[PDB]
């Protein structure tokens, strides 16, 4: 097992064709999950499934620069289920991050932070148990 919050180092940051794979299980009474692609204390890409925001399931994606959150990107397609195993894949593409859950494409998030090499850490937090987190260039 892996400790949560988990820090997956990205020495030399993200680069196109980098495939990050995370394997785990959502906890039985999960409230939220978060992946944080960090550039120091800024968050180039925050991917946040909320099991209950205003009584609705939603994935909120955003960038935090200099302590302030920008323009939220929201989507109602929500494949995570409490108590069930998951596989998240994040494929870094030239102009966006592609996100797939359990081999099904979920969403993409266009790069706001364009200096990709400075996005040096992936924080993985929230209501999950984690078994694997790594990346391979494809
Ligand atoms: C309203 C509102 N309700 N939530 C948010 C923030 O929305 C952001 C996206 O826009 C991030 O999701 C922030 N966030 C979530 C977490 C996290 C997630 C986890 F799952 C865990 Cl486990 C964990 F510990 C931590 N840390 N920071 C979250 O606090 N905002 C919001 C939205 C905007 Cl655009 C601007 C300002 C706010 C503010 F926070 F000030 F209120």
GROMACS .gro file of C-alpha atoms and ligand atoms in nm:
model
  179
    1UNK     CA    1   0.000   0.000   0.000
    2UNK     CA    2   0.085   0.372  -0.042
    3UNK     CA    3   0.038   0.647   0.220
    4UNK     CA    4  -0.244   0.898   0.151
    5UNK     CA    5  -0.185   1.195   0.096
    6UNK     CA    6   0.071   1.050  -0.153
    7UNK     CA    7   0.336   1.259  -0.328
    8UNK     CA    8   0.435   1.120  -0.672
    9UNK     CA    9   0.755   1.311  -0.778
   10UNK     CA   10   0.766   1.441  -1.136
   11UNK     CA   11   1.138   1.535  -1.172
   12UNK     CA   12   1.154   1.751  -1.484
   13UNK     CA   13   0.779   1.802  -1.465
   14UNK     CA   14   0.513   1.678  -1.701
   15UNK     CA   15   0.594   1.615  -2.066
   16UNK     CA   16   0.370   1.511  -2.359
   17UNK     CA   17   0.317   1.130  -2.383
   18UNK     CA   18   0.369   1.094  -2.003
   19UNK     CA   19   0.113   0.842  -1.877
   20UNK     CA   20   0.045   0.852  -1.504
   21UNK     CA   21  -0.138   0.550  -1.360
   22UNK     CA   22  -0.295   0.546  -1.012
   23UNK     CA   23  -0.449   0.230  -0.864
   24UNK     CA   24  -0.656   0.229  -0.547
   25UNK     CA   25  -0.997   0.188  -0.383
   26UNK     CA   26  -1.249   0.458  -0.291
   27UNK     CA   27  -1.324   0.440   0.086
   28UNK     CA   28  -1.672   0.301   0.181
   29UNK     CA   29  -1.821   0.642   0.279
   30UNK     CA   30  -1.623   0.875   0.056
   31UNK     CA   31  -1.686   1.248   0.039
   32UNK     CA   32  -1.410   1.370  -0.197
   33UNK     CA   33  -1.090   1.290  -0.383
   34UNK     CA   34  -0.820   1.518  -0.521
   35UNK     CA   35  -0.522   1.500  -0.760
   36UNK     CA   36  -0.299   1.813  -0.745
   37UNK     CA   37  -0.038   1.875  -1.019
   38UNK     CA   38   0.178   2.122  -0.827
   39UNK     CA   39   0.429   2.387  -0.949
   40UNK     CA   40   0.571   2.474  -0.604
   41UNK     CA   41   0.265   2.588  -0.400
   42UNK     CA   42   0.066   2.673  -0.720
   43UNK     CA   43  -0.159   2.395  -0.854
   44UNK     CA   44  -0.134   2.381  -1.232
   45UNK     CA   45  -0.420   2.126  -1.240
   46UNK     CA   46  -0.654   2.036  -0.955
   47UNK     CA   47  -0.893   1.742  -1.034
   48UNK     CA   48  -1.156   1.717  -0.767
   49UNK     CA   49  -1.440   1.461  -0.767
   50UNK     CA   50  -1.693   1.577  -0.502
   51UNK     CA   51  -1.938   1.302  -0.403
   52UNK     CA   52  -2.175   1.571  -0.278
   53UNK     CA   53  -2.162   1.937  -0.381
   54UNK     CA   54  -2.510   2.103  -0.333
   55UNK     CA   55  -2.652   1.746  -0.318
   56UNK     CA   56  -2.498   1.653  -0.661
   57UNK     CA   57  -2.200   1.444  -0.774
   58UNK     CA   58  -1.956   1.665  -0.968
   59UNK     CA   59  -1.591   1.676  -1.074
   60UNK     CA   60  -1.444   2.027  -1.036
   61UNK     CA   61  -1.119   2.111  -1.214
   62UNK     CA   62  -0.919   2.428  -1.157
   63UNK     CA   63  -0.576   2.601  -1.135
   64UNK     CA   64  -0.454   2.789  -0.829
   65UNK     CA   65  -0.192   3.060  -0.892
   66UNK     CA   66  -0.057   3.289  -0.619
   67UNK     CA   67  -0.317   3.159  -0.360
   68UNK     CA   68  -0.624   3.228  -0.586
   69UNK     CA   69  -0.842   2.978  -0.772
   70UNK     CA   70  -0.928   3.056  -1.132
   71UNK     CA   71  -1.224   2.963  -1.367
   72UNK     CA   72  -1.374   2.626  -1.254
   73UNK     CA   73  -1.436   2.354  -1.515
   74UNK     CA   74  -1.724   2.134  -1.407
   75UNK     CA   75  -1.865   1.807  -1.522
   76UNK     CA   76  -2.149   1.580  -1.401
   77UNK     CA   77  -2.021   1.247  -1.551
   78UNK     CA   78  -1.895   1.078  -1.230
   79UNK     CA   79  -1.757   0.720  -1.248
   80UNK     CA   80  -1.619   0.684  -0.891
   81UNK     CA   81  -1.816   0.465  -0.652
   82UNK     CA   82  -1.775   0.435  -0.274
   83UNK     CA   83  -1.594   0.117  -0.162
   84UNK     CA   84  -1.494   0.016  -0.518
   85UNK     CA   85  -1.150  -0.023  -0.681
   86UNK     CA   86  -1.044   0.237  -0.935
   87UNK     CA   87  -0.777   0.305  -1.193
   88UNK     CA   88  -0.712   0.668  -1.282
   89UNK     CA   89  -0.494   0.740  -1.584
   90UNK     CA   90  -0.373   1.092  -1.662
   91UNK     CA   91  -0.215   1.122  -2.011
   92UNK     CA   92  -0.019   1.446  -2.059
   93UNK     CA   93  -0.088   1.576  -2.411
   94UNK     CA   94   0.071   1.883  -2.576
   95UNK     CA   95  -0.222   2.122  -2.495
   96UNK     CA   96  -0.410   1.931  -2.218
   97UNK     CA   97  -0.417   1.660  -1.953
   98UNK     CA   98  -0.646   1.370  -2.060
   99UNK     CA   99  -0.815   1.187  -1.766
  100UNK     CA  100  -0.957   0.832  -1.791
  101UNK     CA  101  -1.116   0.634  -1.503
  102UNK     CA  102  -1.137   0.250  -1.523
  103UNK     CA  103  -1.022   0.255  -1.892
  104UNK     CA  104  -1.298   0.506  -1.988
  105UNK     CA  105  -1.208   0.862  -2.093
  106UNK     CA  106  -1.359   1.110  -1.845
  107UNK     CA  107  -1.237   1.461  -1.930
  108UNK     CA  108  -0.950   1.679  -2.040
  109UNK     CA  109  -0.813   1.995  -1.884
  110UNK     CA  110  -0.631   2.241  -2.111
  111UNK     CA  111  -0.293   2.359  -1.986
  112UNK     CA  112  -0.317   2.702  -1.817
  113UNK     CA  113   0.036   2.671  -1.678
  114UNK     CA  114   0.224   2.626  -2.013
  115UNK     CA  115   0.577   2.577  -1.860
  116UNK     CA  116   0.512   2.204  -1.814
  117UNK     CA  117   0.861   2.121  -1.683
  118UNK     CA  118   0.792   2.329  -1.363
  119UNK     CA  119   0.489   2.104  -1.266
  120UNK     CA  120   0.719   1.889  -1.046
  121UNK     CA  121   0.487   1.700  -0.801
  122UNK     CA  122   0.154   1.514  -0.814
  123UNK     CA  123  -0.029   1.522  -0.477
  124UNK     CA  124  -0.292   1.246  -0.440
  125UNK     CA  125  -0.532   1.303  -0.144
  126UNK     CA  126  -0.882   1.236  -0.011
  127UNK     CA  127  -1.108   0.942   0.070
  128UNK     CA  128  -0.911   0.660  -0.096
  129UNK     CA  129  -0.678   0.365  -0.030
  130UNK     CA  130  -0.382   0.364  -0.276
  131UNK     CA  131  -0.187   0.055  -0.411
  132UNK     CA  132   0.018   0.206  -0.702
  133UNK     CA  133   0.114   0.551  -0.843
  134UNK     CA  134   0.374   0.594  -1.113
  135UNK     CA  135   0.433   0.720  -1.462
  136UNK     CA  136   0.580   0.591  -1.782
  137UNK     CA  137   0.657   0.779  -2.099
  138UNK     CA  138   0.457   0.614  -2.388
  139LIG     C1  139  -1.686   2.800  -0.315
  139LIG     C2  140  -1.585   2.690  -0.307
  139LIG     N1  141  -1.603   2.562  -0.263
  139LIG     N2  142  -1.487   2.495  -0.277
  139LIG     C3  143  -1.394   2.579  -0.331
  139LIG     C4  144  -1.256   2.542  -0.370
  139LIG     O1  145  -1.266   2.498  -0.503
  139LIG     C5  146  -1.138   2.476  -0.562
  139LIG     C6  147  -1.166   2.452  -0.713
  139LIG     O2  148  -1.213   2.572  -0.766
  139LIG     C7  149  -1.067   2.358  -0.491
  139LIG     O3  150  -1.152   2.245  -0.511
  139LIG     C8  151  -1.055   2.398  -0.338
  139LIG     N3  152  -0.989   2.287  -0.265
  139LIG     C9  153  -1.029   2.156  -0.249
  139LIG    C10  154  -0.930   2.099  -0.169
  139LIG    C11  155  -0.925   1.967  -0.113
  139LIG    C12  156  -0.990   1.863  -0.182
  139LIG    C13  157  -0.983   1.735  -0.130
  139LIG     F1  158  -1.047   1.637  -0.187
  139LIG    C14  159  -0.911   1.710  -0.015
  139LIG    CL1  160  -0.890   1.553   0.030
  139LIG    C15  161  -0.849   1.815   0.055
  139LIG     F2  162  -0.792   1.793   0.170
  139LIG    C16  163  -0.856   1.945   0.006
  139LIG     N4  164  -0.832   2.196  -0.141
  139LIG     N5  165  -0.870   2.306  -0.198
  139LIG    C17  166  -1.195   2.432  -0.280
  139LIG     O4  167  -1.185   2.475  -0.147
  139LIG     N6  168  -1.453   2.704  -0.351
  139LIG    C18  169  -1.393   2.817  -0.411
  139LIG    C19  170  -1.398   2.822  -0.552
  139LIG    C20  171  -1.333   2.927  -0.618
  139LIG    CL2  172  -1.328   2.926  -0.787
  139LIG    C21  173  -1.266   3.029  -0.550
  139LIG    C22  174  -1.262   3.023  -0.409
  139LIG    C23  175  -1.324   2.916  -0.340
  139LIG    C24  176  -1.313   2.909  -0.188
  139LIG     F3  177  -1.248   2.801  -0.149
  139LIG     F4  178  -1.249   3.009  -0.128
  139LIG     F5  179  -1.427   2.903  -0.126
   0.00000   0.00000   0.00000
